[PDB]
């Protein structure tokens, strides 16, 4: 059988950037032509190996992370970025071997009354490791007095929610991101 | 340190105010697209829920020691949110001042005036009043206008401005200002970098020196203009005297444009008027903004954005609203960018097309500053930036290579003079004017001006400083200052006066690294990637450099230059100074129309 990757592309829901998740590829034979013969994607941006040599190429298994940002924040899902979805949300490895697919989804996650689903983490004690997920929602202590449980002056609640309008600009709308992970039974 | 502190919570403030201010901004755009009863709670609820937010993160943002940062970004960025604002005032005293200001934007906006001859007749301000002041040629019915708007509209406004002046000076005075008049001056104020620093009485200076400059040429000006008005209202205007205020092209006299019909050098020339040929060719509100938005990328600006193209109002609704004609360029937030104006197809809507979307320009270059810092410059920065575009939109050079002018329009040294006419009545007659007033405003908020004699010293200082008479005489009843927008609307108004001075300062830097060799009235920067970098570099710098410094990035000065705008008349001023041998440059503070 060959690989699901519609299960994941076409996928009618996605997560949020801060609560990705991961599907693994077991042993199917992949089916890189249909990701390649269509201009349906906004980047395409490959890291560490070629985006045609993984047809003829086998590795010991595939990861597929979907997730939604930003417009302005795809360029952080790339290798030693250090933006705030780079830093608190999703940080990709200096030896990442694989491609980051996104495509403009302003037509089915953007609402008038804004979509306020898909969130982010925006402050976090420190940085996230490669390919790291953090889904907690304590609060965030900034200053020495204690939260106790509940926020406010210098507590701050740590995810905050993009609230994607169809009237905001291409770079404030709504992409989804598919991140494909070649690890060394999948071939091509 | 208070410094991460205050990092991780300016960031707090940046995502929590975007989201804010655009369901504030987005309802601004749904009043004045469609004004509905309802879109008023909606334009003012959701704005109020924006005006408690400022409040409170300007008071929480006062707890951060300010002295302690050491990184430049963070400091310029609570600068602007340790105001303490206007809810320093009572609870009740804030209430009753917010209402006066209604009063008054309402009787300036509903102000009626009927006439006696035609009682059934009432005209309003627009299009009623200002279509008498810009195009009648009877020195009686003129007056009339000029006259009804300050009695009866006028009148109307003298106890209110009298408790505006009074509850706006304890919003003020307990902000650590000296009067309300001081709290407007902090626009210019710079207290940061070593050789940029700027005081707000150093703004009074600077302005008054740099009138001096102008004073010759306003006067020749001056001097020209009135020998023209003598021809057209004639034993009405002493050679020597000054000129009555109703006769200068519109209500208050704050432009000598329409006095052009009336004082053209050479009239027998082909006017270089353009709304005919737009309309013969089939031209609409998408050609105009179209054309314009070609204008931008022929430098290497981006385009308008889709979203401007679609949420935009180029056009009076037509089948369904009411609008605010006014064009205003909108920025929202979140990329989202939008022009509304009432375009017709006429020049002039044509070059303000260019003023309204070099707004988007400056409005998308510094989109990458953090939230606090998406700002002009300074409060003249936005309209200098604008004026500059319709300078090079106006050029006969751009509108043949636009289609719009003939190939073989004679562009002699005459119909040189004529443009330069026509550009010194708009923009160095409003310079007096401008200063005047707002010097007026800053002694009344002064409190140098007893309110039993504001209007004996507003009009001694309009003979004395700006050469117009009343052509009647006015006790203290009348408020002819409140008779204007931005005085019975509270607004600033010397941001025409130094924004005047930029759009200059800014047009001598851009020609040069456009390489323009002419004179500078005849300079176009269309197809200047090099110039428009330059300006780009600057657009991007938004509020967080101090505006002595974005200046000093393409001008290279740390304040205003009276030089440039000099220089840009000098064909002009020097052909005046023929005119005016045997004519009488200035005029008497003591003549006036009645006596
Ligand atoms: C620099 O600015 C000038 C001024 O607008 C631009 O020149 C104009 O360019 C257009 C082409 O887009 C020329 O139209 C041409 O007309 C001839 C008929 O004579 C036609 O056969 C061609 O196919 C073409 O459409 C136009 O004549 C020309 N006018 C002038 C005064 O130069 C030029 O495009 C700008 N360069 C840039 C933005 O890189
Ligand atoms: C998603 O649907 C399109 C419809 O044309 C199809 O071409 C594409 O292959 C589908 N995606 C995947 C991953 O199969
Ligand atoms: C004007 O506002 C009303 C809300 O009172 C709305 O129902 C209507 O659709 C608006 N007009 C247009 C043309 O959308
Ligand atoms: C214009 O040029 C002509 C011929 O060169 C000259 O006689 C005339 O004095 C000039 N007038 C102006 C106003 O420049
Ligand atoms: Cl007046
Ligand atoms: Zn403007």
Redesign the interface.
């Given at each position: 059988n060959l690989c699901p990757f519609g299960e994941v592309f076409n996928a009618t829901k996605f997560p949020s950037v801060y609560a990705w998740e991961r599907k693994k590829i077991s042993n199917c034979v992949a089916d890189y032509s249909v990701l390649y013969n269509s201009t349906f994607f906004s980047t395409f941006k490959c890291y560490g190996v070629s985006a045609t040599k993984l047809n003829d190429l086998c590795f010991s298994n595939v990861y597929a992370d979907s997730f939604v940002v930003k417009g302005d924040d795809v360029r952080q899902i790339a290798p030693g970025q250090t933006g705030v979805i780079a830093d608190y949300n999703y940080k990709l490895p200096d030896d990442f071997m694989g491609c980051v697919l996104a495509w403009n989804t302003r037509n089915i996650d953007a609402t008038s009354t804004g979509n306020y689903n898909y969130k982010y983490r925006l402050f976090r004690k420190s940085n996230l490791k490669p390919f790291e997920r953090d889904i907690s929602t304590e609060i965030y202590q900034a200053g020495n007095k204690p939260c106790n449980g509940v926020a406010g002056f210098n507590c701050y609640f740590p995810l905050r929610s993009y609230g994607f309008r169809p009237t905001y600009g291409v770079g404030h709308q709504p992409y989804r991101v598919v991140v494909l992970s070649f690890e060394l039974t999948v071939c091509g | 340190l208070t410094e991460?502190?205050a990092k991780?919570?300016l960031?707090?403030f940046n995502?929590e105010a975007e989201?804010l201010s655009?369901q504030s901004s987005?309802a601004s755009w749904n009043y004045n697209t469609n004004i509905t009863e309802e879109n008023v709670q909606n334009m003012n609820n959701a704005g109020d829920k924006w005006s408690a937010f400022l409040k409170e993160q300007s008071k929480?943002a006062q707890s951060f020691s300010l002295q302690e940062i050491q990184t430049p970004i963070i400091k310029r960025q609570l600068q602007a949110l340790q105001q303490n604002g206007s809810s320093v005032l009572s609870e009740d005293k804030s209430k009753r001042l917010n209402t006066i200001l209604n009063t008054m934007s309402t009787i300036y906006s509903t102000g009626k005036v009927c006439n006696p001859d035609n009682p059934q007749e009432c005209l309003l301000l627009e299009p009623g009043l200002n279509e008498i002041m810009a195009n009648s040629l009877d020195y009686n019915e003129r007056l009339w206008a000029w006259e009804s708007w300050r009695s009866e509209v006028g009148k109307q406004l003298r106890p209110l401005y009298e408790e505006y002046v009074v509850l706006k000076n304890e919003m003020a005075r307990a902000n650590h200002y000296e009067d309300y008049g001081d709290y407007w001056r902090g626009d210019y104020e710079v207290n940061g970098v070593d050789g940029y620093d700027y005081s707000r009485g150093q703004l009074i200076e600077d302005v008054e020196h740099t009138f001096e400059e102008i004073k010759p040429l306003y006067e020749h000006l001056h001097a020209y203009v009135r020998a023209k008005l003598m021809n057209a209202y004639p034993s009405y205007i002493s050679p020597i005297g000054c000129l009555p205020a109703h006769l200068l092209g519109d209500m208050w006299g704050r432009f000598w444009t329409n006095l052009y019909s009336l004082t053209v050098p050479f009239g027998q020339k082909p006017n270089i008027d353009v709304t005919d040929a737009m309309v013969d060719q089939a031209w609409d509100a998408q050609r105009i903004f179209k054309e314009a938005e070609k204008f931008f990328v022929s430098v290497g600006l981006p385009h308008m954005?889709?979203?401007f193209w679609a949420?935009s109002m180029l056009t009076e609704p037509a089948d369904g609203r009411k609008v605010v004609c006014h064009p205003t360029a909108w920025d929202?937030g979140?990329?989202?960018?939008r022009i509304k104006m009432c375009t017709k197809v006429t020049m002039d809507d044509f070059l303000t097309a260019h003023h309204e979307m070099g707004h988007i320009q400056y409005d998308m270059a510094y989109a990458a500053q953090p939230f606090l810092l998406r700002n002009g410059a300074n409060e003249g920065f936005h309209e200098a930036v604008g004026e500059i575009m319709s300078l090079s939109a106006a050029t006969p050079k751009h509108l043949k290579s636009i289609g719009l002018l003939s190939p073989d329009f004679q562009e002699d040294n005459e119909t040189e003079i004529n443009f330069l006419l026509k550009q010194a009545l708009t923009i160095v007659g409003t310079l007096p004017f401008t200063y005047m007033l707002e010097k007026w405003r800053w002694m009344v908020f002064k409190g140098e001006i007893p309110k039993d004699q504001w209007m004996k010293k507003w009009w001694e200082m309009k003979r004395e400083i700006v050469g117009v008479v009343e052509p009647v005489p006015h006790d203290e009843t009348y408020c002819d200052p409140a008779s204007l927008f931005h005085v019975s609307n509270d607004y600033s108004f010397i941001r025409y006066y130094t924004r005047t001075l930029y759009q200059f300062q800014f047009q001598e830097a851009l020609c040069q690294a456009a390489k323009h060799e002419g004179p500078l009235h005849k300079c176009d920067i269309s197809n200047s990637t090099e110039a428009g970098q330059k300006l780009f570099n600057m657009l991007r710098l938004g509020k967080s450099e101090p505006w002595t410094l974005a200046l000093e990035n393409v001008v290279g000065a740390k304040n205003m230059n009276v030089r440039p705008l000099l220089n840009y008349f000098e064909p002009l001023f020097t052909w005046l100074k023929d005119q005016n041998k045997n004519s009488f440059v200035g005029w008497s503070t003591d003549w006036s129309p009645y006596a």
């Open positions: - | 991460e502190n991780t919570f960031n707090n995502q989201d655009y987005l929480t954005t889709q979203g949420n929202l979140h990329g989202d960018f």
